[PDB]
Amino acid sequence: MRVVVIGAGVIGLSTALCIHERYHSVLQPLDIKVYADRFTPLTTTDVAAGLWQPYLSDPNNPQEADWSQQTFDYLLSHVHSPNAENLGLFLISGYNLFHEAIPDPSWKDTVLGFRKLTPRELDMFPDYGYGWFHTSLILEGKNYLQWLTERLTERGVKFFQRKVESFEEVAREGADVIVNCTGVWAGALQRDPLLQPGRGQIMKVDAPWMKHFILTHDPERGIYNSPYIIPGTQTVTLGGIFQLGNWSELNNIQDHNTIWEGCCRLEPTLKNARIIGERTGFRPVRPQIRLEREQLRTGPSNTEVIHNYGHGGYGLTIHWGCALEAAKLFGRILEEKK
Amino acid sequence: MRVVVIGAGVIGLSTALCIHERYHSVLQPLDIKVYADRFTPLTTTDVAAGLWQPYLSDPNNPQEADWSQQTFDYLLSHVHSPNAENLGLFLISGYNLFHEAIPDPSWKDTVLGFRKLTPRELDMFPDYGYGWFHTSLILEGKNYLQWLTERLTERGVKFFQRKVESFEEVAREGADVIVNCTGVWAGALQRDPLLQPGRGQIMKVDAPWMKHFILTHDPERGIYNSPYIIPGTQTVTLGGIFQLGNWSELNNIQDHNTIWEGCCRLEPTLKNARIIGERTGFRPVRPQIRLEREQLRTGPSNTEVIHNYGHGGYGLTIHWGCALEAAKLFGRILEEKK
């Protein structure tokens, strides 16, 4: 009853945790190990600020919307436990700014105290004339990945460092079910033209007076290409860069100036704030999340493969709904045994 | 044309700054010096978290309400300058919790995005069933007193350390107009039975995930005697102690337990947070602020005295409206010269 999960990001770790707590009981003996090329603090998850917020128009797959809601409710039911600081979970309020009047989002009632910005609040941001204010959650990837690792290590889950070159290679090794949580690199295991890197560059600035998140939006520049400021526990994330098809895991100077001159137009207080770090990541951009069960009859035996990747810029927002759905698929393989 | 301001708190410093910028011009040669027993970080102002919020029912003096509004507008017009971090000025959102439904405050439209808490937000605080959410400002006393000191030193304002024993003593020294900004100690210069110490004890805790202020209210325990959590730039202020008539400038253990067991019932995450410090202060409690002009014909000449003290637990909230009003009184003495 052995199962291998490939990848140690928010997807691989929550999926591995979900499957356990759903199939661990005496009658069902379960063996699980995780294979990953990179672990915390070197994953994409470690680069993500952790703000809960879906993509903000009607999703192409209505499933996703419920998975986002499932994640929020799960996280909000945790936000006030003394252990919440170990997963880097806290409550944050903030602004979402626009140039034109857009309809209220689907997640309007998922979030806390959602409302439309007043003219006086809008007068604090002089390039934007419409907007929202609401209370969400930040789930810092660094702390959450440590929490999941701890949680998995005490429940008997072994961890291994290796770069998998094919599913057939891990199938001949022993594993019954393979859980594919490779993120942006899934293509190297099974070609996927739909999956593309959504290059992001961030700036980690020391600004503790910064108490709210500010997200800006314009259909002109596109998604994730507009200034954003996201306070964390130890620093403030300064972003607003999205380059599709870009595989450069190198910090670019032109992007630094774009983020800096954009965030300082929002919060001019940021001009006299020290920079602790700059980092780069690739959002696993896919039109839809691939959360489908696939029988790999092309290789060792009739091996089952659970695909779970392509969560773009909302991996931390959606992860739990996915992890539950993946566990549901694992149960379908189990009931269809013999 | 020499004038002495007694006290270096938020009152003494803003008053001294206001008078200058209102009477500094070539035609009006002005000499001003400040006398104080204690300077930053040893004043009451240094103990105050700096949250802008008036006392929250209809004030006995409707003047005060406009002075509070004058302070907010002045501070909000500054909040987005790159210099705002030097006066410890930033924008903060938060909760005001209640056991019963109370009417909305006077300052409801003075603050940003004021609204009444939703049932789901109220379900995060299980001892309180009504409440408000709004966006205010924090003006940290430590940084603001440094900013004022800097501002005054470059405009030619001399500072002196001395404990004044009487107004007649400073009148024989030379000073034409005396500005009395002694706070809780005003009684030692001119007896005031109305002025009393409103003992406060605070706890400075390291909790950066704490992004909102939480103020609790009950008519049972009284004003300032209910748990409060106020995030600052470098730490989080944990309070909820008010002892009228208490002159003990010593941290009490029983009060520590009261604050700790109260703040942890609100935010249980605070249980595993380090304590950087504990401090004590005395709110200059008076039924009304004494901002009256008084001719001291009892002593050297017909010396004029500007009284400006008794700002209780809202000194940082009101200071600017007071400083402007005091400057207005200084102008009345000037026009009534000869």
Ligand SMILES: Cc1cc2nc3c(=O)[nH]c(=O)nc-3n(C[C@H](O)[C@H](O)[C@H](O)COP(=O)(O)OP(=O)(O)OC[C@H]3O[C@@H](n4cnc5c(N)ncnc54)[C@H](O)[C@@H]3O)c2cc1C
């Ligand atoms: C700059 C930036 C900011 C972001 N901010 C947010 C945010 O605020 N809110 C939000 O909800 N989301 C955010 N995201 C998106 C979020 O980071 C992701 O969607 C999520 O982290 C994707 O993680 P994953 O777990 O799928 O992939 P990853 O975190 O990259 O982890 C993938 C795992 O797959 C492994 N892997 C790949 N190929 C192999 C192989 N052959 N063998 C072994 N292991 C392999 C890696 O080794 C790794 O362990 C942000 C992303 C970026 C880039």
Ligand SMILES: Cc1cc2nc3c(=O)[nH]c(=O)nc-3n(C[C@H](O)[C@H](O)[C@H](O)COP(=O)(O)OP(=O)(O)OC[C@H]3O[C@@H](n4cnc5c(N)ncnc54)[C@H](O)[C@@H]3O)c2cc1C
């Ligand atoms: C625990 C606590 C928390 C608080 N939090 C807030 C808050 O969040 N928001 C808010 O708006 N307000 C708050 N306050 C209230 C605020 O601190 C005060 O109302 C304000 O700081 C009062 O300052 P002052 O300038 O009148 O007096 P102080 O700051 O005490 O300064 C008085 C000055 O008078 C001097 N002085 C007195 N006698 C003499 C003498 N004979 N000779 C020379 N100098 C003399 C002292 O030396 C000193 O320099 C808080 C108070 C406490 C105690």
Ligand SMILES: O=C(O)c1cc2occ(/C=C\c3ccccc3)c2[nH]1
């Ligand atoms: O750049 C990103 O990938 C990113 C940063 C960030 O902070 C919250 C989210 C999730 C969705 C989102 C992002 C920007 C604008 C609207 C929704 C998010 N995505």
Ligand SMILES: O=C(O)c1cc2occ(/C=C\c3ccccc3)c2[nH]1
């Ligand atoms: O204890 C205090 O003196 C105090 C702390 C604090 O934080 C904001 C204010 C100003 C008025 C106030 C205080 C508590 C409840 C309602 C209004 C304030 N006063």
